[PDB]
Amino acid sequence: AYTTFSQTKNDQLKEPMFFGQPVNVARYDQQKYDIFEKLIEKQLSFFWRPEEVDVSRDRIDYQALPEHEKHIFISNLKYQTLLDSIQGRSPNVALLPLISIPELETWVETWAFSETIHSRSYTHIIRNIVNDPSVVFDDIVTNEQIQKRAEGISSYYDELIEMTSYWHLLGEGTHTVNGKTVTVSLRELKKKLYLCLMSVNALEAIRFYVSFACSFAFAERELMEGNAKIIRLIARDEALHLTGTQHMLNLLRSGADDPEMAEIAEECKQECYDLFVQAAQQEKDWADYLFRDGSMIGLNKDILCQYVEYITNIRMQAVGLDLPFQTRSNPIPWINTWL
The catalytic residue positions are 122
5 contacts a second copy (rule: CB under 8 A):
yes
Query: From the CB of 161, what's the least distance to a second copy, in Å?
Result: 6
Question: Which of a second copy, Fe ion, none lies near 127, with the C-beta cut-off 5 to 8 A by kind?
Answer: a second copy
247 contacts Fe ion (rule: CB under 5 A):
no
Cβ atoms of 316 and 205 within 8 Å: the answer is no
Alpha carbon 145 to its chain centroid, in Å, reads 19
- When the beta carbons of 1 and 222 are compared against a second copy, the nearer one is 1
Q: Which of 78, 124, 229, 241 binds Fe ion (CB under 5 A)?
A: 241
25 contacts a second copy (rule: CB under 8 A):
yes
Instruction: Transcribe 80-120 into DSSP letters.
Output: HHHHHHHHHHHIIIIIGGGB-SHHHHHHHHHHHHHHHHHHH
Q: Which of 32, 78, 118, 229 binds Fe ion (CB under 5 A)?
A: 118
Residues between 271 and 310 with contacts to Fe ion, criterion CB under 5 A = none
Query: From the CB of 303, what's the least distance to Fe ion, in Å?
Result: 24
**Distance from C-alpha of 41 to C-alpha of 240, rounded to nearest angstrom:** 11
**Distance from C-alpha of 295 to C-alpha of 63, rounded to nearest angstrom:** 17
Q: Which residues contact 246 (CB under 8 A, 6 or more apart)?
A: 201, 205, 318, 319
Q: Site mask, a second copy, residues 149-188, x = CB under 8 A?
A: -xx-xx--xx--xx--xx-xxx----xxxxx---------
112 contacts a second copy (rule: CB under 8 A):
yes
Residues between 201 and 240 with contacts to a second copy, criterion CB under 8 A = none
Is 241 annotated in some ligand binding site? yes
- When the beta carbons of 238 and 309 are compared against Fe ion, the nearer one is 238
Cβ atoms of 17 and 190 within 8 Å: the answer is no
DSSP-based three-state secondary structure for 180: strand
133 contacts a second copy (rule: CB under 8 A):
yes
Q: What number of chain residues touch Fe ion (CB under 5 A)?
A: 6
**Amino acid at residue number 277:** V
Rg (Cα) of the chain, in Å, rounded?
21
Give CA separation, 251 vs 245, 248, 258, in Å.
10, 5, 8
248 contacts a second copy (rule: CB under 8 A):
no
| Contact residues: Fe ion, CB under 5 A | 84, 115, 118, 204, 238, 241
Annotated binding site for Fe cation: 84, 115, 118, 204, 238, 241
